[PDB]
């Protein structure tokens, strides 16, 4: 049983071909979900679907360095509804991670903090329920 928020531990941190998968349910009225390769108090990829931003849905990425936000990328290609099972795939290459939700391409994400090792957790949080979370080498 998974419950969230939920650290999913990286021994090795995390390195090309390495596949996450996720899946689980978002639940009724969602408001946000956030997945987070961390680096101690460092966030190296922040993922961030937000149903209602300014009656909006938009998902928001991001590197948290220093207790300091960067520029955020944003895409309006929102693949979750309330309410509905998902599966968010992050495969990790040598120059950016790529998220794919339910087996359709959603984003690329360069990497901003290059010691990829160094990721040690991934943290799940957020307005779901959570089945499995793995990872895998492909
Ligand atoms: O980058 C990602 C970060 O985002 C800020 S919100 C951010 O605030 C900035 C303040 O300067 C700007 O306002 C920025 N913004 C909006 C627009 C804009 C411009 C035009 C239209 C339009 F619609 C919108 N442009 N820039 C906002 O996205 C969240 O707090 C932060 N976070 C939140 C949490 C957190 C929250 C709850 C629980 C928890 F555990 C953690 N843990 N990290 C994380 O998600
Ligand atoms: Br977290």
């Known amino acids: 049983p998974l419950t969230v928020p939920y650290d999913m531990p990286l021994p090795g941190g995390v390195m090309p071909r390495m596949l996450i998968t996720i899946?689980?349910?978002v639940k009724?009225?969602?408001?946000?979900?956030?997945?987070?390769?961390?680096?101690?108090?460092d966030i190296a990829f922040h993922?961030?679907?937000?149903?209602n931003e300014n009656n909006?849905?938009?998902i928001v990425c991001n590197t948290?360095?220093?207790?300091?936000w960067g520029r955020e990328e944003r895409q309006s290609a929102f693949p979750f509804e309330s309410g509905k099972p998902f599966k968010i795939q992050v495969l990790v290459e040598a120059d950016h991670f790529k998220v794919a939700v339910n087996d359709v391409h959603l984003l690329q994400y360069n990497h901003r903090?290059?010691?990829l090792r160094e990721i040690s957790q991934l943290g799940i949080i957020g307005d779901i329920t959570?089945?499995?979370a793995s990872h895998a080498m492909i």
């Open 23 to 25: 899946i689980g349910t």
């Open 28 to 41: 009724p009225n969602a408001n946000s979900i956030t997945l987070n390769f961390k680096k101690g108090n």
């Open 47 to 51: 993922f961030n679907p937000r149903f």
């Open 56 to 58: 909006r849905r938009v």
């Open 64 to 68: 948290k360095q220093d207790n300091n």
């Open 113 to 115: 903090m290059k010691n």
């Open 130 to 132: 959570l089945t499995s």
